[model samples]
Target: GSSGSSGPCYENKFAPRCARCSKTLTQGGVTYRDQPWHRECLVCTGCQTPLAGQQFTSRDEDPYCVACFGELFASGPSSG
Candidate 1:
């Protein structure tokens, strides 16, 4: 019989879990609102767009794309 490890190993004993997937994050991930998320999960809350390498804005602990964010939360009355 094999005598390997009985459980999965992580980089750290107290590794944070992915907020979006509820799974333990073993490697590369993004952190926001003091929570950990997998790269694919850290998306703009407004448009569900991926913001991995793109510019984004965070409001009330939620990520947003620049365009959606501006349309949803721009100050002053609409000019149109």
Candidate 2:
């Protein structure tokens, strides 16, 4: 296994870090649907699909793809 470090070294600066990955966010990054996150960082929590230009849904502060969200929440009782 590689190093267990999960985050990058905190640099003494003032910039909006990715809300999902906790990494530094640069210009042209995500600045919508809420917190400032990177482009790929704000992916679907279920299928990991990039929601850059695709329409998705937000649940409990987490992001999910359209199809995944519909399948997850638009379902009825399971078969008996």
Candidate 3:
């Protein structure tokens, strides 16, 4: 009898990785398209601030530093 293990090789942890670089998201990171990315890697297209660190999403697209990112939002935190 030929008995074989018919199952997934890897466990389904439901963990996601970074979208841009395909890096694991085990550390504190953000998710996009079911993946995670480094907080400092992602940048806001509108304001050019690191999105992951700022915790901004494509929906908000408002992730910005104390300088650029907030300026666009107008309600930015600092005027610097």
Candidate 4:
């Protein structure tokens, strides 16, 4: 009832839907707006780690798994 299932609603012509999962967000789902990604899609992408339910949802611009992300632990940030 929040959006009345009209335009931009799940069944509407402009409703938001996840390209990866092909499911409408209006049906009680979460996804990154302006980007095509389901909750699991934005996780590891490689390892498929769900991040929404994690303690901290922090991630690099690119999603990386624990093993792959560890490579940055010793690398310092870029200064430009």
Which candidate comes out best when scored by lDDT?
1
TM-score, prediction 1: 0.65
lDDT tens digits, residue span 1-80, model 3 = 77777766675546666677765767778754355666666676665566554444344532345555345555646656
User: How would you encode candidate 4's per-residue C-alpha lDDT over 20-77 as one tens digit per residue?
Assistant: 7666666544544345566756676445677554432235555555654654443556
List clashing residue pairs in candidate 1: none
Candidate 4 has its poorest 10 consecutive residues by lDDT at 52-61
**Cα-based RMSD of the predictions, in order?**
8.1, 6.1, 9.3, 10.2
Better of 2 and 3 by TM-score: 2
Model 3 clashing-pair count? 4
lDDT per residue as tens, model 2, 1-80: 67875887775757888876777876768754767878877788888888987888888877888888887776666833
Residue runs of model 4 more than 4 Å from their true location after superposition:
1-12, 53-62, 65-67, 72-80
lDDT (CA) for every model shown? 0.80, 0.78, 0.58, 0.55
Model 1's alpha-carbon lDDT is: 0.80
In terms of TM-score, the best-performing candidate is 2
For model 3, the superposed segments whose C-alpha errors exceed 4 Å read 1-14, 53-80
